[PDB]
Structures are given as C-alpha cells and as structure tokens.
Design a protein around this ligand. Structure first.
Ligand code: HEM
Ligand SMILES: C[C@H](CCC(=O)NCCC[N+](C)(C)CCCS(=O)(=O)[O-])[C@H]1CC[C@H]2[C@@H]3[C@H](O)C[C@@H]4C[C@H](O)CC[C@]4(C)[C@H]3C[C@H](O)[C@]12C
Ligand SMILES: CC1(C)SCCN(S(=O)(=O)c2ccc(Oc3ccncc3)cc2)[C@H]1C(=O)NO
Ligand SMILES: [Zn+2]
Ligand SMILES: [Zn+2]
Ligand SMILES: [Zn+2]
Length: 462
C-alpha cells in the first residue's frame, strides 16, 4: 500500500515548498516522489510527521548516507551530529553536546547574563548607525555567532575582527553549498568524486570553513588549562579525547573535534540570527505589534534593567510574538531529511526501508486546519482570549523525535533575550522613503527574509 504520487522534473526547485502544497492538495498528506534513483516520501501535517518521527521514531532516526562528506574528514567514528548516521557515533556526540551545553550554564543564570552582555554589544552597534537605514543581518549574525563561539570556543570576537568576518563569510557560503546542485549530484552519483577538479571545487567553502576553525582550535589547544574544569565545549571534548586515547571505538578523536565544533558553531549562527532577522522585519511591517511588545517590556522589566529568562513567564505577549516569528518565518520549511531503518506504516501507507523522508515542517506551521490565519503574522496564534500564552502542538519548528534540534533550548534563550533587549532600547521602522519590504523569504535550505533595511531609533537617552 504505497503512497500516491505523479517526478524528476515535475518538482520546482526554485520554490519547492509551494510545489509540495500542490502535490499535497492533489495526492494527500503522504505522497511519493522518485528523485535521482532515490525514493522519497514527503510527510505533511502534524500527524504524518508525528507518526513517522515519534510513533515509529526507532525506525526513522537515521539520515540518508552522504558520501561527499568524506572530504570534510567524515568516517565511521567521525560523523558530527547533524549529518551523522543513527548509531553510536551520533548518540555519543549528541548526548555529549546536550549535556556539555547544559553544564556550561545553558539552563542557568551564567549563560543568560552572557547573552545579555552580547545583546548590549549588539544594541551599541545598532546605536552607532545614528538612526540611518541599514541591513541588520550582519550584526545579528555576529552577535549570535559570539554566543555559540563563547560556548564552543571559550571566546567572542570583535565585530571588526577580520578573522571573525572570514569565519562568518565562509559559513554563510558553506551553507549555500549544502543545497547547491553540484553537491547533491556527486553525493547521488559517487564516482565523479575522484576527478581532481570536481573534488577541488565542491565544498570549497565548507573545507575553507573547517580550515579556518582548525586555526582557532590550534590556538585554543595552546591556551587550554587541563588542570582546571573545562570552560567550554572544545575543552570538554579535548578532556574526553585524552581519556579515550587507545580506544578505537570512541568518537572523541581529532577528526571529529573539528566536525562537531563546526556543526554546533555553524548551526548556532545561521538559525537564531535568521529568525531574529525575520523578527525585526515583522516588527517594522507590524508596528502595532512592536509597540505592544515595548509596552509589555516596560510593565515587567523597565527601560534600563537587562532582561532575564524569569521575565518570560510574566510576558505572554512577547512570548507569543517570538513564537509567531518562528512559525511565520518558517526558517527550515522542509526540515532535514531522515531515512527509514525498517518498513513502517504512516497514515495507512506502507513506507519501505531505505526511503528518504522529507518532514514538511512548513505544512505543520502553516496548516490551515490548525491555525486561525496561517498565512498572516498573527501573535494571537499563541494567545487565548484572556491573553495567556498557549503553544499548540503544531508548533514544530525544531521537528520531533530523537533528532529534534538539540539547539532548541539555546535558541529559546537567545530569541527571548536578544529580541527583548533590541525592542527594549530601540524603535524599528521602515526607512522614511523606501517601499514596504516583502514578507516572503528567499527559499534555500534555510529561508531568510528578502533583503530589507530598517532604522533603529533609541527610545531614551538615559
Ligand atoms: C531558531 C533556531 C533553530 C531552528 C528553527 C532549528 C531547526 C532544526 C531542525 C528542523 C532540525 C532537524 C531535526 C530533524 O532531523 O528532524 C535541527 C537539527 C539540529 N540542530 Fe537546529 N535549529 C535551530 C537552532 C539551532 C542551534 C542554535 C543549534 C546549536 C546550538 C542547532 C543545532 C542542531 C543540531 C546539532 C541538529 C542535529 C540534531 C541531530 O541530528 O540529532 N540548531 N534543527
Ligand atoms: C536524494 C534526493 C535529494 C537530492 C536533492 C535533495 C533536496 C534538496 O537538498 C533541497 C531540499 C532540502 C531539504 O532539507 C529537504 C528537501 C529537499 C527538497 C531535498 C530532499 C532530498 O534530500 C533531495 C531531493
Ligand atoms: C559541520 C558542517 C560543515 S558538515 C556539512 C554541513 N554543514 S553546514 O555548515 O552546511 C550547515 C549548517 C547549518 C545547517 O542548518 C541547520 C543546522 C542546525 N539546526 C538547524 C538548521 C545545515 C548545514 C555543517 C553542519 O552540519 N552544521 O550543522
Ligand atoms: Zn577554552
Ligand atoms: Zn487562559
Ligand atoms: Zn537604551
């Protein structure tokens, strides 16, 4: 009983999410596609995604093999987390990252204070624009990159630092290669790998990004004090590397240190800062909502004191707006692919072993059966009539199951602290004479808002 479907060129790749709406209205919530000899089943809506990732989660936590990553040093015990196959290498790094982030202060007050210190740096770089129009994306990336740089590498960088700039530039470009035509065709057709020029051109920026990290990791190895408890995730990793010398089963090796640190670092940049970029864009398209958040900040926090996570429970409207920015911004619309380890049943359809699953997360965040006004920016999607915060089950921007985004608690903290700090100290607006920016993003693996400019005008002198 396989799922219905049409394939290879009946799929618009310059606007895939809208194409998958058409096939879902045609064939239903679970449909098939055959793309380059790989069988694909697309999952749509909460129940199909939840059935596959939670109910059959034991059989859907694997990823599709990616032989092109062999250039970045990937091997059976060197697989990072994000593209790692389901197995001991993935499980050890995932638990290590999850608990190392926690022990470095994630769920606690030292990280909150760190993030608001970085928000102040970001606020100051905003004020240095003298109320003139500017694209906020670059400074967002730097402020958010410094948070993950702090957790993984034990340091931040100056916004003018050329090494930081190169690091961000290579990462943004290396992300663009993950969803480029060349990358998948050699991952699809493997043999083309050996051809020298094809090997030297693909993942040039991802290989450059890793090279630039090796340089920071080498300096960190110089400054690390093993006689003291690990200050950051790289030190925690290196300590585990030492204990594991002589153990060829450990994923704590030199090949995996650069991959894991790159994984967390690059993920820590591109996600939260893109969401924040949608946030500001939507605050200048909906100044009524901006003003209402600014009112809630004043009644709970004030205009001088820095925000804390203990405020959020008393700020349902600001929490609603932030959730709505993630729901509307829809930053990863087609998720990250999984693959079945067994035959499974989703929505009464049989899905064979070895099928690439596409969790259509956009079809969950914008499900017309679930949300009042899915195609509008509407904070009341997360509010009830008395103004209490409610989170529907369809809020799945981080996916579900054993592979669900391990960054989620850091993202939640960063989103709240950076967002409220910016709105606490500035008033954001479309620039005086410019056309009203689009609310449609540019589709890639990650969906950023269409490029726009804003003006940040302080709310106070003192
Ligand atoms: C707004 C911010 C973010 C969003 C919307 C987001 C979304 C996602 C999604 C949809 C997945 C795929 C889960 C699946 O396989 O079904 C994922 C995985 C992952 N994310 Fe995030 N992410 C965000 C921020 C972050 C941050 C800040 C980090 C690191 C600190 C991070 C690290 C990871 C990692 C390592 C994985 C792989 C998890 C695994 O395979 O076990 N993400 N994320
Ligand atoms: C094997 C078949 C490979 C080749 C190109 C891949 C797609 C692209 O990468 C773009 C996009 C990224 C999202 O993550 C997941 C959805 C989507 C459509 C991918 C799914 C899958 O992986 C594809 C179809
Ligand atoms: C270590 C690697 C260079 S190995 C090859 C792939 N990249 S990448 O820089 O192209 C990348 C970055 C972010 C991302 O999107 C995310 C991540 C996390 N949560 C939600 C969305 C996807 C891919 C690195 C990687 O795996 N990072 O995680
Ligand atoms: Zn350190
Ligand atoms: Zn209520
Ligand atoms: Zn101020």
């Amino acid at each position: 009983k396989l799922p219905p479907g049409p394939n290879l060129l009946h799929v618009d790749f310059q606007n895939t999410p809208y194409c998958f709406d058409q096939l879902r209205r045609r064939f239903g919530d679970v449909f098939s596609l055959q793309l380059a000899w790989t069988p694909v089943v697309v999952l749509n809506g909460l129940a199909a995604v939840r059935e596959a990732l939670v109910t059959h989660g034991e059989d859907t936590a694997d990823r599709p093999p990616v032989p092109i990553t062999q250039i970045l040093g990937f091997g059976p015990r060197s697989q990072g987390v994000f593209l790692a196959r389901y197995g001991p290498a993935w499980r050890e790094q995932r638990r290590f990252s999850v608990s190392t982030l926690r022990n470095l202060g994630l769920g606690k007050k030292s990280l909150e204070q760190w993030v608001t210190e970085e928000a102040a740096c970001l606020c100051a770089a905003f004020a240095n624009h003298s109320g003139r129009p500017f694209r906020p994306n670059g400074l967002l990336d730097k402020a958010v990159s410094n948070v993950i740089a702090s957790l993984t590498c034990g340091r931040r960088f100056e916004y003018d630092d050329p090494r930081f700039l190169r690091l961000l530039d290579l990462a943004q470009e290396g992300l663009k290669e993950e969803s480029g035509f060349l990358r998948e065709v050699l991952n699809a057709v493997p043999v083309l790998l050996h051809i020298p020029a094809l090997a030297g051109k693909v993942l040039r920026f991802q290989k450059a990004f890793l090279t630039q990290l090796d340089e920071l990791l080498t300096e960190h190895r110089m400054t690390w004090d093993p006689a003291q408890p690990p200050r950051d995730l790289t030190e925690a990793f290196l300590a585990e590397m030492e204990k594991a010398k002589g153990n060829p089963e450990s994923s704590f090796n030199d090949e995996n240190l650069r991959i894991v640190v790159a994984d967390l670092f690059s993920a820590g940049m591109e996600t939260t800062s893109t969401t924040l970029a949608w946030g500001l864009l939507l605050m200048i398209l909906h100044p009524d909502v901006q003003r209402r958040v600014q009112q809630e900040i004043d009644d709970v926090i004030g205009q001088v004191r820095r925000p804390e996570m203990g405020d959020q429970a008393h700020m349902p409207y600001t929490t609603a707006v932030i959730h709505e920015v993630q729901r509307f911004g829809d930053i990863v619309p087609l998720g990250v692919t999984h693959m079945t380890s067994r035959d499974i049943e989703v929505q009464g359809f049989r899905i064979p072993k070895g099928t690439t699953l596409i969790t259509n997360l956009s079809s969950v965040l914008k499900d017309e059966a679930v949300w009042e006004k899915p195609f509008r920016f509407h904070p009341e999607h997360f509010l009830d009539a008395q103004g209490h915060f409610v989170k529907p089950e369809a809020f799945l921007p981080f996916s579900a199951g054993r592979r669900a985004c391990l960054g989620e608690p850091l993202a939640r903290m960063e989103l709240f602290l950076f967002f409220t700090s910016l709105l606490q100290h500035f008033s954001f607006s479309v620039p005086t004479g410019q056309p009203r920016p689009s609310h449609h993003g540019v589709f890639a693996f990650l969906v950023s808002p269409s490029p726009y400019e804003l003006c940040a005008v302080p709310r106070h002198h003192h």
